[PDB]
């Protein structure tokens, strides 16, 4: 599923992302935007370390989800990476929350530091009623 901007913003808010661990909805939207363009079945294989990013947030399989083929990987979200390729994002949001419970917070995603940090993210939530 490829979400429309405001449609996703309400979905995330509904799921408890607004200000989760101090991370506003705008920052989450900016992350989803630059990671997958709001697409849940987005996947990117990493040939260098044999890992794969899955879903709307492009969560990597080395540490977060089990796909059975990433060498020495872990499953911190207790989820099959397939769960992050669903149209319903509940599981991907629960995994995203787990990621930010770690020391780095929203900084875990380099794309966030690249395209969202110290930037004007108001535009992602304007007019969405969130």
From Swiss-Prot:
Subcellular location(s) of the protein: Secreted
Domain C-type lysozyme: 1-130
Domain of life according to the entry: Eukaryota
Disulfide bond entries: 6-128, 30-116, 65-81, 77-95
An annotated GO cellular component: extracellular exosome
Pfam families, sorted: Lys
Name of the top EC class for this enzyme: hydrolase
Chemical reaction(s) catalysed: Hydrolysis of (1->4)-beta-linkages between N-acetylmuramic acid and N-acetyl-D-glucosamine residues in a peptidoglycan and between N-acetyl-D-glucosamine residues in chitodextrins
Keyword annotations of the record: Amyloid, Amyloidosis, Antimicrobial, Bacteriolytic enzyme, Disease variant, Disulfide bond, Glycosidase, Hydrolase, Secreted, Signal
Disease: Amyloidosis, hereditary systemic 5: A form of hereditary systemic amyloidosis, a disorder characterized by amyloid deposition in multiple tissues resulting in a wide clinical spectrum. AMYLD5 primarily affects the viscera, and the predominant clinical features are renal dysfunction of varying severity, and intra-abdominal bleeding. Inheritance is autosomal dominant.
Role: Lysozymes have primarily a bacteriolytic function; those in tissues and body fluids are associated with the monocyte-macrophage system and enhance the activity of immunoagents.
More details: Lysozyme C is capable of both hydrolysis and transglycosylation; it also shows a slight esterase activity. It acts rapidly on both peptide-substituted and unsubstituted peptidoglycan, and slowly on chitin oligosaccharides.
Subunit structure: Monomer.
Family: Belongs to the glycosyl hydrolase 22 family.
Name listed for the protein in its UniProt record: Lysozyme C
Phylogenetic classification of the source organism: Eukaryota, Metazoa, Chordata, Craniata, Vertebrata
